[PDB]
Design a protein around this ligand. Structure first.
Ligand SMILES: NC(=O)C1=CN([C@@H]2O[C@H](COP(=O)(O)OP(=O)(O)OC[C@H]3O[C@@H](n4cnc5c(N)ncnc54)[C@H](O)[C@@H]3O)[C@@H](O)[C@H]2O)C=CC1
Ligand SMILES: [K+]
Ligand SMILES: [K+]
Ligand SMILES: [K+]
Ligand SMILES: [K+]
Ligand SMILES: [K+]
Ligand SMILES: [K+]
Ligand SMILES: [K+]
Ligand SMILES: [K+]
Ligand SMILES: [K+]
Ligand SMILES: [K+]
Ligand SMILES: [K+]
Ligand SMILES: [K+]
Lengths: 496, 496, 496, 496
């Protein structure tokens, strides 16, 4: 754990930052063709941070063209895997050298607490880039068992220009989850970050040039959803799009592919993740520690967040007590105060969506056992709502904020049925002392990860992604992320 | 190599067949709810074969419901891999016992010649099922390198109810390419075959019941594209659709996914496959033999068909000469006549499309060097059209008939640029005596298979599928077909 | 489960058997060069069964020469994996057609009960051959991530002539465990079975010729250890030896390799396998069912047999009670009486070794809680000895008979220490209701398999083999058995 | 490519080195218990470098004991793969910072020329460690297809205390080839280096402590073959030995295993590697360039060295001519002189063996076409001996010096038979323009690597190791090196 600075010292670092403002295309910064900009404001203070280039289909066309040329060049693609690894490791170094700068910049643009930006987001981003850089020259393709008269290989090739559309809850980490495997594979990429959180991706693109990523191989095009993301998804020279965000918006990229060049689309979408607590747990306070973390890490702005606590009727009350006590340890406020584990939500509009589910809870006359408060029109208290039946809108809809629903069950067959009563299937957690119960819960819950007696998303080597409406066509992290950005080729050589 | 019968003998098998007519749903035959039928006719004669149930959204809803109930109660997927292998092997045994019956039925409904139905289609169908049956209890999933405090498995689970939408050109073989891996993975499957070629799929689904595939696990819903295919793609309980057919239609299934439950979609589509012949080949007669087979096997009704001959100027004429000689061994006519390697095209509508390209050749004043004639409104001669420039419509568009365009090059860089001059990328073949040239053609042609010094699609162990607009998201055959029908799950077990 | 016949009917099948008697070399039977024979007698009756060729280094030389020629030929090796699979599947069919004959013959030569020979040994043998036949055309080798200037494959090739030295406790199953992977890989093999149990291997070799295994590819050379096994291990043209038997004898094959041609040696040796029962098991009677089976299946003549019951002090007595009750279900006698789960030990000499540990228990004044009796100088009762400390010779030495030692423990750290207090490391079983305890026991016991809440050896797809002195250099079953019989080759093709 | 210094500058680094002298055991330096030493001298001058501790069975016992205690308490192996990777990367960083120091030290002790020590040995050593560090958290184990009633994992565990016995020809590189994979797998390692070349291993073990390799995990015990190597191979707590050296000595470690605890033994031994040159190569000068490098890199003190040139009669003379021309670029002399590609042989004893083969050439009245002279009792010229028949001693025996035999062939079947005319099978190279010939030479030469149209040993990702008497049981480099130091375990968890 790197040492945390003081509030004043972070403010001092903020004050000296030269925030990026222009798109990054073909090796350097440039304004949008139409010269428009949009406001990036610190959600916790209201202060304007920068006037960021507001790109449209014209800018996207230029960015894709510079990526297409670089791909056809071979300037990046033709380096050896060991060489591509070296350059991406250089990039990760530079991020590490600039860690405090990037951590403060991430916090300012997003509302995320500096404490977690420094200890989690930045180290996780640096480690994602290192892991995928190191992986590329460890990947073996195959030869097929075809006999002595032929030599058949089954190998992988970079798909081409790759569009990467990002959300705002983990700007840098999501950036690394995508560019890591995509760049290591030898693709050129065009990154359209969230307009709420565009600054750090722009800075990382500049650092990548310094590291020797050639011009045109890693471009960042900031702008709105319809204005910049749709032309990217529709572009006839983009070979593949990887998207993370809402299901509603991910569906559009399936249309964009269908109506353009049949580009491969991979979606990582939302979830309504359950946390199942059996009555045979060995340590209830440790469970409560994991449930609180799962529900409220990053203010609940987390695709893997625990949002449905599904708890055995005999331990519900004892668990709720220990959850309330754990919550006393979760300070919320000024994202640059290192004492805070909770910062501001990303934007007035997102704050309004979360707070609307506070209202919905009260409309449904549900018991708000903990939390329920708002501050400064941008902070929501960690909230726990008891007595939530599967028919509640709080049970069924992704809130993406610090709001935990609680549902009781009487036997494990009901817990599993409840856990699967969703159109989503991203993640799940299960808590039990029993081998029998643990095998049931981890095998029968239909989710892309099931953690047992802990909360989390795995590590750099385990794939992450959704069943059902939580994802489409792939997985982030692990060696399987490489599949997103490559085509399989059978080379069959007669030898008869 | 099984022994061919006489024309009269095949006619006698045909006269005794009890052709299936009804949807196969939940372990038995049934009529469409609305009582509608459509006329399946022998494309070589115009004679009615059967009035086949014309299923609609309601029948699709019943078929999916039975597939869903079978999936949920585990009657198939809870059997061990070894048990699922045994039942699939029973099925392939049954197809083998009914080989002649199935070959004649396949010919009658499709126009495909009995000779190839008996020696290629049925044995390849039987083998596809055996290989994928045999594969399932040889597949290992993973555990991830996460250290001593946790145990992390990365496993595959069956995705659920699977929709399988098939084309008319290889009815039985495409069926096996889909149900082989999908049933072996433990999915329930609802098959919507082409209306031109529905009889054999129905017969197989009946034999699968006999072999112990439980009720609801393998259903066949015959009917039209909009009437039965669309409701299947839109169905909220179908988890995945695998499609083989035109790019135009495959685009629709991406929209159906976007507009319903975000089901996984895998598309296998058309191609415009090149055949590159260098001036350093060791046996021009053998090249001619492979190029003729690649262009005119199955009357060019073949996704992998050689349709663009891209030949070095020094060998163009001497190749064409041996091609003509080879074409003298390719007899066309009555599909039940064992002497014919070429039968009838699938329908008057398709014959029209193919003939309009013969007219287009004349419109473009191109040299028709071989063939060019039609017979009886349903046969087309193997045709070779010389001097086709990349701007020609015959160079750019999928004809799906026995029509080979010929284009010259001077150097291998031009050959490669010509081979990739297409929105497609399904297959490619390349002939050369040079190690240097072989590696260069193998690596630089953007296709899912490149055969060197032969024509083909690989074997059971090699993946088949398109780059670019020839495919989306997957590969048929090989162990990679398994990925289409399964979800990855990380099971992360704390052990701290 | 195939239907069991009556005692009289098995006797009738025995009476009509034409027992093999000669070595099987280069496609057919032949006497030993020196014309000597040795007696094969039914251990349960004393009756002579056959005078079997008593081969020496001369016969071994001929067998290896016929295998060397076949390997150099390519007659087997050069068939495609799919073709080798077909022939080995034919062989498995023939065994199935002759199942009752082989089951009776196995029982007569070995003492093993006909009930288990019919229901277990023969089906397991047939399934081993089928699994490895099916596997061969599912195995992919690799290509290395070396960049664009070279094409590097990493492939596997058959090592050559392979010597297979077998024990007597599972003659057919061990035969299949070895020839399966070795033949599927394309090696020629020379099999030296145990002199106690040579008949069924000879019969299987004849059936393999009928199935189309070419002459010289699968030879069987019966004879003594020093007389026939040592020349095989020393032969300068044998490329690899796979051995199963005692550690003492396995050590010799390391010397034989060192003193001859450095052939690869793989050893599968004995064990002193623990069975750990925690005090938190959910069903004690079901544990007792698994412990009794583990200790006494095949009369304890089992490398994976449970021989050290390591049981928590609070459940020892309750477990011993349920073990005694389970034992009432285990009838021992006349191996052709289908009512018997226990048959005769393999030979007077082995009977004397087992009975010597009965004496040793009484010498050490240990409590013999169950069993302790002998019959007919060839049957030992299932025996349970209580109060066995780690210093006892019964704790430390492989008995290979129906004798279970019992040791108490007070906490799981002592159970694990006890479990690992051995020079062996073949197998282990652990029984617990706790996830925490199950993870500890399965990760910290140093054995090649740990089964949890059941007893066994895995299945056809899981590797089997020993840590420490229980094995050397490989694993039987699973895809990893293939490694035993192949060499890795890197083919590096410049392409610069 | 790092910048070479002047002869005087290297001499000045040499004059300042504080050479290690003591065994490295349990995290620090210590004397041998008996107080003995042996004289390590510069083979180019005769000057004493250091009196090095001369360890015996007692010191080996202490080193193993510290390695055992470290293994049992998990100080290294209980760290995560990612943590073990980080410390190994620290180590490789340290070697990089001391590159010049280590290169000069390597030259002094071995006679290897400083130029190759600086540009090949050290960078390859540094890279070996990085690759194997980077690999460990990319390795996935397996789960087996056993059905729904059980969960079966097939995992790898570290084998325990590992003995690593090294030769003198590539001291640092062989060290990395062994400790890279073995430390990454979590083993403790006891290294017994060659007495000629012990200094650099000692230095590295000290740097490994600095890098956070815990005490006892990486020990170095210098001393003689019988005195230190034998007790290591016989030690009852060493689980595995990996050996690289002569076949004669490697045979002894198989006996040591047999006569102690049945520890796993992996042997990498000598070779007699062929270089096959077809008459259809496109650039005879480039072939000559690869054949010269293959024969005379590291003065022919190279297990992969080209020692049998097997050349088509039509190109023999024109090849030899360009070989002579190439040899004019290979300067021999003072190992600290950066101009020299060839330094001193390792010892007067080895110089004697090499010279006796020069005398043997003259005895056999063979045409010495190039070289043939010696200087100063320790240098040997690059020598090419023409007209060597397969019956010659120079054709059959490992010389391990800069001596190339030349043999002609008329057809490729004879070339292949000549290449395989040996008890060895470590490496081979093959030059041809023909695709047909390349596949034929690639597949039919029985060696662990066949390079086509180049000379080499592959790269970090490809396995290196011998067929036949060149190896036993394993491969160095690549992911397969991991198998040497790990045990497979099936964890079968009932879930019925
Ligand atoms: N292919 C290869 O990698 C190598 C092959 N060689 C060949 O082997 C020949 C002999 O050279 P050597 O220096 O004697 O190599 P070697 O095979 O005897 O030495 C290898 C290692 O084994 C150790 N050793 C030697 N005798 C031992 C014994 N009785 N017990 C245990 N360990 C023992 C040595 O101290 C050294 O560390 C060379 O002339 C050359 O032909 C030598 C070096 C490397
Ligand atoms: K902002
Ligand atoms: K939606
Ligand atoms: K695509
Ligand atoms: K029809
Ligand atoms: K279209
Ligand atoms: K989906
Ligand atoms: K016997
Ligand atoms: K022993
Ligand atoms: K060997
Ligand atoms: K020395
Ligand atoms: K020797
Ligand atoms: K061992």
């Amino acid at each position: 754990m790197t040492e945390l600075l003081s509030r004043e010292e972070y403010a001092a670092i903020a004050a000296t930052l030269d925030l990026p403002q222009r798109a990054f295309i073909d090796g350097g910064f440039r304004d949008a063709c139409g010269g428009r900009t949009f406001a990036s404001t610190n959600p916790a203070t209201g202060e304007l941070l920068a006037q960021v280039a507001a790109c449209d289909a014209e800018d996207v066309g230029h960015a894709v063209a510079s990526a297409r040329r670089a791909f056809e060049d071979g300037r990046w693609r033709s380096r050896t895997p060991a060489e591509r690894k070296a350059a991406l490791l250089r990039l990760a170094e530079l991020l590490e050298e600039h860690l405090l700068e990037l951590a403060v910049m991430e916090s300012l643009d997003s509302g995320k607490p500096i404490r977690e930006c420094q200890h989690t987001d930045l180290p996780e981003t640096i480690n994602t880039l290192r892991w995928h850089a190191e992986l590329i020259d460890k990947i073996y393709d195959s030869t097929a068992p075809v006999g002595s008269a032929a030599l058949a290989m089954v190998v992988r090739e970079p798909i081409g220009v790759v569009g990467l559309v990002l959300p705002w809850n983990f700007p840098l980490l999501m950036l690394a989850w995508k560019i890591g495997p995509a760049l290591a594979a030898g693709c050129s990429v065009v990154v359209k970050p969230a307009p709420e959180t565009s600054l750090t991706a722009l800075r990382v693109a500049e650092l990548a040039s310094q590291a020797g990523i050639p011009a045109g191989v890693f471009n960042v095009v900031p702008g709105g959803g319809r204005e910049a993301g749709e032309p990217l998804g529709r572009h006839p020279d983009v070979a593949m799009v990887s998207f993370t965000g809402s299901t509603a918006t991910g569906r559009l990229f399936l249309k964009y592919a269908a109506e353009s060049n049949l580009k491969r689309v991979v979606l990582e979408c939302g979830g309504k993740n359950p946390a199942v607590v059996m009555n045979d747990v060995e340590d209830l306070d440790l469970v409560a520690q994991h449930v609180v973390n799962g529900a409220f890490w990053n203010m609940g702005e987390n695709c893997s967040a625990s949002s449905r606590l599904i708890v055995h009727a005999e331990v519900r009350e004892a668990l709720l007590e220990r959850i309330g006590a754990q919550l006393r340890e979760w300070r919320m406020g000024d994202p640059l105060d290192p004492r805070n584990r909770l910062g501001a939500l990303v934007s007035p509009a997102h704050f309004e969506k979360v707070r609307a589910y506070l209202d919905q809870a009260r409309t449904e006359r549900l018991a708000v056992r903990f939390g329920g408060a708002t501050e400064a029109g941008i902070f929501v208290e960690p909230t726990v709502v008891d007595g939530v039946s599967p028919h509640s809108r709080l049970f069924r809809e992704e809130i993406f904020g610090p709001l935990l629903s609680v549902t009781s069950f009487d036997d494990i067959d009901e817990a599993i049925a409840l856990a699967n009563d969703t159109v989503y299937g991203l993640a799940a957690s299960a808590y039990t002392g029993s081998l029998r119960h643990a095998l049931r819960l981890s095998r029968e819950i239909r989710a892309g990860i099931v953690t047992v007696n802990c909360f989390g998303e795995g590590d750099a080597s385990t794939p992450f992604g959704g069943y059902k409406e939580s994802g489409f066509g792939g997985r982030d992290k692990s060696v399987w992320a490489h599949d997103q950005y490559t085509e399989l080729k059978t080379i069959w050589i007669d030898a008869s």
